[PDB]
A paper describes a structure:
Crystals of a ternary complex of KpsC-NEc were also generated using the D160C variant. While the structure of cysteine is less similar to aspartate than asparagine, the cysteine variant converts more fully to the adduct and was anticipated to be more stable on the multiweek timescale required for crystallization. The D160C variant was expressed in E. coli BL21 (DE3) and then crystallized in the presence of 1 mM CMP and 5 mM acceptor 2, a β-Kdo-(2→7)-β-Kdo disaccharide. The structure of this complex was determined at 1.20 Å resolution; notably, this appears to be among the highest resolution structures currently determined for a GT. The resulting map revealed highly detailed density for the Cys160–Kdo adduct and for acceptor molecules in both copies of the active site present in the asymmetric unit. Chain A, which contains CMP, the Kdo-adduct, and the acceptor, is the focus of the discussion below. Cys160 Cα is shifted roughly 1 Å into the catalytic pocket to compensate for its shorter side chain (compared to aspartate or asparagine), and the anomeric carbon (C2) is shifted 0.5 Å towards Asp/Asn/Cys160. One noticeable difference is that the C1 carboxylate rotates ∼90° and hydrogen bonds with the guanidinium group of Arg45. The acceptor disaccharide interacts almost exclusively with residues from the N-terminal α/β domain. The C1 carboxylate group of Kdo-A1 is hydrogen bonded to Lys202 (the only directly interacting residue from outside the N-terminal α/β domain), as well as to Kdo-A1 O8.
KpsC is a dual-module glycosyltransferase (GT) essential for “group 2” capsular polysaccharide biosynthesis in Escherichia coli and other Gram-negative pathogens. Two separate GT modules in KpsC transfer 3-deoxy-β-d-manno-oct-2-ulosonic acid (β-Kdo) from cytidine-5′-monophospho-β-Kdo donor to a glycolipid acceptor. The N-terminal and C-terminal modules add alternating Kdo residues with β-(2→4) and β-(2→7) linkages, respectively, generating a conserved oligosaccharide core that is further glycosylated to produce diverse capsule structures. Based on the formation of covalent adducts with Kdo identified here by mass spectrometry and X-ray crystallography, we determined that catalytically important active site residues are conserved in WbbB and KpsC, suggesting a shared double-displacement mechanism.
Author numbering: 1 to 145, 148 to 324
Write the structure that this text describes.
């Protein structure tokens, strides 16, 4: 069925439930067996390069996997297995250079409008229930009473930045723009939870904070923090889409999966070309395509094929406890 080289992918519980077909472990030192129809790798991680080369030489297509957008309770870097994966037979969502399976799903407007009730239900649970990709962080504590601008940091070796046509230099450009364009505001630079855990680095290690430019190094749930801000600047973070769900304006310095559909203030030099390729989409079309069609889910108790709604309910149940 599907060949898996990576031992890290192979150990994902219920891998075959996400892929919807049988899977088998392959060795880098043996030929591709005839019974394998496609090879699955993790996005454009460095670990994917050898299996991608082998697939090309063997005449086999590549499927790219990654975490879903509502993934788990604890962080991926803390060894928590995923409850959702993305499955991409074309490219991968974060690679802006060519269409992905997700881009094509977004463009199928009719298939997305069919899902409008499920989209509205899940959107409401995510925002008002304060859910995200990772779900263990407590809510941010603050007075609910319009002068705060959020600048989102990411992880230094994450491929969404690179394949979104960006790198460390766009993080500096983003911060400088947030400062200059909002001279009366406080600028909050939010550090990524993987970096707060000590497992990864970010893009602002050298930043000298000031009275106006502050570091947010508390691990807090995104929707709770978004209630306290007036607008959001990103390079390629998933936070940008979560900020759209929260009703905030979003400025993008990279080319993430949700840029160039008409819903974001796009700053990248390739924005016009990408917008021409993508066209327009509504927020609910983007949400249905990504969260309901592109992402696949398993049941957190039985392991069987599931849906977003079941995963959300479980994650809310586990939170009350924890
Ligand atoms: C004969 O000489 C010879 C033979 C072989 C070699 C050689 O090259 N050997 C090494 C082969 C490659 C070893 C790969 C180790 C396992 C990596 O597992 C994964 C992967 O990349 O496939 C499994 C995935 O499910 C992920 O966990 C990824 C990680 C790291 O690559 O990706 C991220 C992460 O950075 O943490 C990416 C994120 O976007 C996110 O998905 C997170 C996730 O939440 C979990 O943390 O994974 O590892 C030489 C010589
Ligand atoms: N600075 C950041 C960036 C991301 N995040 C979290 O990490 C998830 C994934 O975002 P990235 O695409 O930035 O890795 C977000 O959904 C959110 O839970 C955060 O909480 N603070
Ligand atoms: O490490 C990566 O390649 C990155 C890819 C992103 O789309 C996203 O998955 C990100 C993680 O959220 C980091 O925890 O990592
Ligand atoms: Cl760079």
């Amino acid at each position: 069925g599907i060949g898996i080289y990576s031992p890290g992918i192979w150990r994902i519980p219920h891998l075959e439930k996400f892929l919807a077909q049988p899977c088998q472990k392959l060795s880098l030192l043996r030929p591709v067996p005839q019974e394998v129809n496609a090879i699955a790798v993790w996005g454009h991680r460095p670990s994917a390069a050898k299996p991608v080369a082998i697939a090309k030489a063997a005449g086999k297509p590549v499927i790219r996997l990654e975490d879903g957008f509502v993934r788990s309770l604890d962080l991926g870097v803390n060894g928590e297995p995923p409850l959702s994966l993305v499955v991409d037979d074309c490219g991968i969502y974060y690679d802006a250079s060519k269409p992905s399976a997700l881009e094509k799903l977004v463009q199928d407007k009719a298939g997305n409008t069919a899902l409008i009730s499920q989209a509205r239900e899940a959107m409401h649970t995510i925002v008002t229930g304060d859910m995200s990709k990772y779900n263990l962080a407590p809510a941010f504590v603050a007075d609910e009473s319009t002068n705060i601008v959020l600048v989102v940091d990411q992880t230094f070796n994450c491929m969404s930045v690179t394949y979104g046509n960006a790198g460390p230099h766009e993080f500096a450009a983003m911060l400088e723009a947030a400062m200059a364009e909002n001279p009366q505001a406080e600028i909050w630079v939010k550090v990524h939870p993987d970096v707060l855990e000590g497992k990864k680095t970010g893009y602002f290690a050298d930043l000298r904070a000031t009275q106006r430019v502050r570091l947010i190094a508390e691990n807090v749930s995104p929707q709770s923090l978004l209630r306290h801000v007036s607008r959001v600047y990103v390079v390629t973070s998933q936070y940008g889409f979560e900020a759209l769900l929260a009703g905030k304006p979003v400025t993008c310095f990279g080319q993430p999966w949700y840029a160039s559909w008409g819903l974001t203030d796009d700053r990248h030099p390739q924005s016009a070309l990408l917008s021409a390729r993508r066209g327009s989409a509504t927020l609910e079309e983007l949400f249905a395509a990504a969260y309901l069609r592109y992402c696949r889910y398993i049941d957190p108790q039985t392991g069987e094929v599931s849906d977003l709604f079941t995963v959300l309910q479980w994650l809310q149940l586990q939170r009350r406890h924890h």
